[PDB]
From Swiss-Prot:
Disruption phenotype: Cells lacking this gene become significantly more susceptible (16- to 32-fold) to penicillins as well as third-generation cephalosporins and carbapenems. They have no detectable beta-lactamase activity. Is inhibited by sulbactam, tazobactam, and clavulanate. Sulbactam inhibits the enzyme competitively and reversibly with respect to nitrocefin. Tazobactam inhibits the enzyme in a time-dependent manner, but the activity of the enzyme reappears due to the slow hydrolysis of the covalently acylated enzyme. In contrast, clavulanate reacts with the enzyme quickly to form hydrolytically stable, inactive forms of the enzyme, via irreversible acylation of the catalytic serine residue. It holds the Pfam family Beta-lactamase2. It comes from Mycobacterium tuberculosis (strain ATCC 25618 / H37Rv). This is Beta-lactamase. Extended spectrum beta-lactamase (ESBL) that inactivates beta-lactam antibiotics by hydrolyzing the amide group of the beta-lactam ring. Displays high levels of penicillinase and cephalosporinase activity as well as measurable activity with carbapenems, including imipenem and meropenem. Plays a primary role in the intrinsic resistance of M.tuberculosis to beta-lactam antibiotics. It catalyses: a beta-lactam + H2O = a substituted beta-amino acid. The lineage of its organism: Bacteria, Bacillati, Actinomycetota, Actinomycetes, Mycobacteriales. Changing I75F: Significant increase in ampicillin resistance. 2-fold and 3-fold increase in catalytic efficiency with ampicillin and nitrocefin as substrate, respectively, mainly due to an increase in substrate affinity. One of its GO terms (cellular component) is extracellular region. The class A beta-lactamase family has a specific amino-acid numbering system, sometimes called Ambler or ABL numbering and often misspelt as Amber. A multiple sequence alignment was used to derive a consensus sequence and then the consensus was numbered taking into account insertions and deletions. This allows use of identical numbers, e.g. for active site residues, despite differences in protein length. UniProt always uses natural numbering of residues, hence there appear to be differences in numbering between this entry and some papers.
Length: 265
């Protein structure tokens, strides 16, 4: 059965794999370790942008945010080029999703306001959507440690898949805001070797990745069949057993996604 295939990927990659695909009118749910916790890594940046879209009118996307060198934390491919000029909220949303810009994500968290530099506001947003599992505790920083077993900054494939489904396919955002989220995810630059690589080229794929130490490698996606039928695919992985320096394995996520594609096609 399907569980056997995922368990075989775990054995082969020396990894823990989590998979969830919400049930639909056309498919039963796919679940493997779907209610086990995995580090968000950068996958929270997609619902983060949704929180920002939700909390403001769309005119807010043109608000210019300025910041300094002291705000550059973690890989920030876009934000590192605009220290002098600043970036709009919309530009930050773009960067946070499409380039996993950490500084962009921290500035969006700030834009949410409230305690913890926005991490509470973000978590409250998830709570609002019906997610009582996921939590963000910590801003982006390349100095962050997050050892296995710590519940901080974690979600579950089940929880994050239901969130993404509400955001992109459901009614959590009005259509004008929904379209921006979808488009940013559709033009992501970081995901070509994960879920995208497990689905035939005639499927549409939009996604948001995350990568971390302990071999952490995640991808959350919405896919559309060649006949236009959408599904949400969350695949999360780590290799806590190999320690801090365990290599993330994108191919694990591609191959999990291949299994999923088989069930859905």
């Amino acid at each position: 059965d399907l569980a056997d295939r995922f368990a075989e990927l775990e054995r082969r990659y020396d990894a823990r794999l989590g998979v969830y695909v919400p049930a639909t009118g056309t498919t039963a749910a796919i679940e493997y370790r779907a209610d086990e916790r995995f580090a968000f890594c950068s996958t929270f940046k997609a619902p983060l942008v949704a929180a920002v879209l939700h909390q403001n009118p769309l005119t807010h996307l043109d608000k210019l945010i300025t910041y300094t060198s002291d705000d550059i934390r973690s890989i920030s491919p876009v934000a590192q080029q605009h220290v002098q000029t600043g970036m709009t909220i919309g530009q930050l949303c773009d960067a946070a999703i499409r380039y996993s810009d950490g500084t962009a994500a921290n500035l969006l968290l700030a834009d949410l306001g409230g305690p913890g530099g926005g991490t509470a506001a973000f978590t409250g947003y998830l709570r609002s959507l019906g997610d009582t599992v996921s939590r963000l505790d910590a801003e982006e920083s390349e100095l962050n440690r997050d050892p296995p077993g710590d519940e901080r900054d974690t979600t579950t494939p089940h929880a994050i898949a239901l969130v993404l489904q509400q955001l992109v396919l459901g009614n959590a955002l009005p259509p004008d805001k929904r379209a921006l989220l979808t488009d940013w995810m559709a033009r992501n630059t970081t995901g070509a070797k994960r879920i995208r690589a497990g689905f035939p080229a005639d499927w549409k794929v939009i996604d948001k990745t995350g990568t971390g130490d302990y071999g952490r490698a995640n991808d959350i996606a919405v896919v559309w069949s060649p006949t236009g039928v959408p599904y949400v695919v969350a695949v999360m992985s780590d290799r806590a057993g190999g320690g801090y320096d365990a290599e993330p394995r994108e191919a694990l996520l591609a191959e999990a996604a291949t299994c999923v594609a088989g069930v859905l096609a």
